[PDB]
């Protein structure tokens, strides 16, 4: 477990790679894996639609179970359920989506739920469809968390554009 590789060093305790989240996880077998998730924990695209297709729907089917009970989650609020065939854990963080007029400030938030665990393979937040700009969301990575954090960025363009900006 937690057999990470081909990663650059950004700070101590803060790595990235140009990288499938889903075949990271495949290979590495985390601990914890993080999803972008929503509040409803309805996984139908992007981040949260791979991981979920990659553990064919029983991810979605727990999130219903649980999401029937307990009701939705808050933005910048986090959930642990189980990671089924790609990791132990699967922690549900929900980033703000500034595309739909959420707070950005809440991104702070969302990222201090990654401190309750030793290691994580996360996406880099708010990303791609959440509309949250990137060298951003990487900064506050960067200044909140505290734990090791692996970020798996599937977009070479954006991965040199990340790297290049946080070498400045
Ligand atoms: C082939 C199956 N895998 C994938 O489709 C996949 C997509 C993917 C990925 N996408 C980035 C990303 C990061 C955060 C968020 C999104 C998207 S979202 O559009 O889902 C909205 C919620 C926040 C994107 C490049 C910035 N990052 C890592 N591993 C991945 N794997």
């Given at each position: 477990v937690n057999s990470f590789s081909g990663?650059?060093?950004?700070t101590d305790n803060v790595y990235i790679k140009n990288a499938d989240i889903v075949e990271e996880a495949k290979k590495v077998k985390?601990?914890?894996v993080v999803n972008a998730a929503n509040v409803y924990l309805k996984h139908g695209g992007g981040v949260a639609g791979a991981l979920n297709k990659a553990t064919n729907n029983a991810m979605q089917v727990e999130s219903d179970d649980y999401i029937a009970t307990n009701?939705?989650?808050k933005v910048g609020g986090s959930?642990?359920?189980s990671g089924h065939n790609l990791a132990k854990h699967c922690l549900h963080v929900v980033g703000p989506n500034v595309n739909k007029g959420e707070d950005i400030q809440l991104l702070k938030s969302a990222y201090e739920n990654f401190?309750?665990?030793e290691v994580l393979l996360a996406p880099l937040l708010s990303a791609g469809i959440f509309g949250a700009d990137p060298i951003?969301?990487?900064?506050?990575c960067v200044d909140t968390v505290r734990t090791n954090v692996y970020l798996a960025v599937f977009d070479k363009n954006l991965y040199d554009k990340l790297v290049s900006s946080?070498?400045?």
């Open positions: 990663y650059l060093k950004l985390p601990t914890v009701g939705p989650l959930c642990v359920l401190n309750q665990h951003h969301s990487l900064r506050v946080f070498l400045e």
